[PDB]
């Protein structure tokens, strides 16, 4: 089957350079061309250029020239996109696509990459427990939560009672504040079964971390 094996993901600092690949298989490499697309957190997709076959090489979309540079390697089926003068404004997912003629356009894509451009150092979270709403707000079902604020990089794991409380949980998308991230999750359960001290919040941040209990 045709397949394009891009290889990412990158976490890098400002003003640096990164070259990211696209390896094609299942087809005659020199009978097509590789296009590259930017997937913004603003989520519309954006074409930056094409190299090989029909072409507007080096890099070539009004926005991206001089910024990105595109190169090839027929001996080992790999394309190369090179971004440099990197900023946070360049954190995105970069796709590589086979540019097909009249059996029209992008018929195969890459998995995407993900590049995170930050100045923040590896920072372990401060996780602290959210106990029952106003304190007088426990009548029929209660909701409790845990704040995981201030860590770098992603991700973080967060469960409630080892994995056994899954119903009614809601964990949020990590949002970014000022170089570091924050996450929250809430569990709602029946009022008669807590304050037993039967609920513990479990957080794991791979650069070494661990879990808090909702007391009384």
């Amino acid at each position: 089957q045709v397949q394009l094996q891009q290889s990412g993901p990158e976490l890098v600092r400002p003003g640096v350079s990164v070259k990211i690949s696209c390896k094609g298989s299942g087809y005659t490499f020199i009978d097509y061309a590789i296009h590259w697309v930017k997937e913004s957190h603003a989520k519309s997709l954006e074409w930056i250029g094409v190299i090989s076959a029909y072409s507007g090489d080096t890099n070539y979309n009004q926005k991206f020239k001089g910024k990105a540079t595109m190169t090839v390697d027929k001996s080992s089926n790999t394309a190369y996109l090179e971004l440099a003068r990197l900023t946070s404004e360049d954190s995105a997912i970069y796709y590589c696509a086979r540019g097909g003629w009249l059996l029209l356009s992008f018929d195969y894509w890459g998995q995407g990459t993900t590049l995170t451009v930050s100045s923040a150092k590896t920072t372990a979270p401060s996780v602290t427990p959210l106990a029952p709403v106003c304190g007088d707000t426990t009548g029929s079902s209660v909701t409790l939560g845990v704040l995981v604020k201030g860590y770098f990089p992603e991700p973080v794991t967060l469960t409630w009672n080892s994995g056994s409380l899954s119903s009614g949980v809601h964990t949020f998308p990590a949002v970014l504040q000022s170089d570091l991230y924050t996450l929250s999750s809430s569990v709602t359960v029946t009022s008669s079964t807590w304050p037993s001290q039967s609920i513990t919040c479990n957080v794991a941040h791979p650069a070494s971390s661990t879990k808090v209990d909702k007391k009384i």
Partner: protein, 219 residues
Amino acid sequence: DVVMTQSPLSLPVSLGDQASISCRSSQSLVHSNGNNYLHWYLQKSGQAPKLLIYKVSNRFSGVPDRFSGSGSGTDFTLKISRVEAEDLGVYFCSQSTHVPLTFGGGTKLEIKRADAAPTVSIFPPSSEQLTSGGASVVCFLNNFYPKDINVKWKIDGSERQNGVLNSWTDQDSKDSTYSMSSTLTLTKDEYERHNSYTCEATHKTSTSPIVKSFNRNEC
């Protein structure tokens, strides 16, 4: 630069139902050899866009028999007869007839269910964060629909607010509702100079705003 405008951005459809998406371009996409080089791609959460239709009407390999393609030059429409579970996602369209290529804005197709009012919950600062010196107040407005809501923080009646961090979930797999969290962060200093802290939400399930607040920590 052919701007492709596509509407609607959001389309709540019941499964089983039929849907249609408009895609439109500022310059005719009919090339000198005669073809409209318009295309539709589907990007599912967390996957890479996949082609779904090319030219205007051509289905790609193993695309289910239920998607049509129609158009010419500046107006084009995708239609699906029975919307199915594996069809929720963002549809895109592109034009290859002119360089550079442009992608339309996207149309996220969601499930259409009934109005549900958020359950709102406010939490005071963790007695062990004060010890650090920060003071966050978190507020969850869980399980509501439609997605439109606006949450406001009031400290002692005033809504002076800027230190807010909001986060939102996508449409739940079971009840098809959403959930949001709002966090107003302050310092232990700022925080211990005030009394009440309110959280209030505006959603079409109530003509009165939903309010939640508590009192204390000062002097």
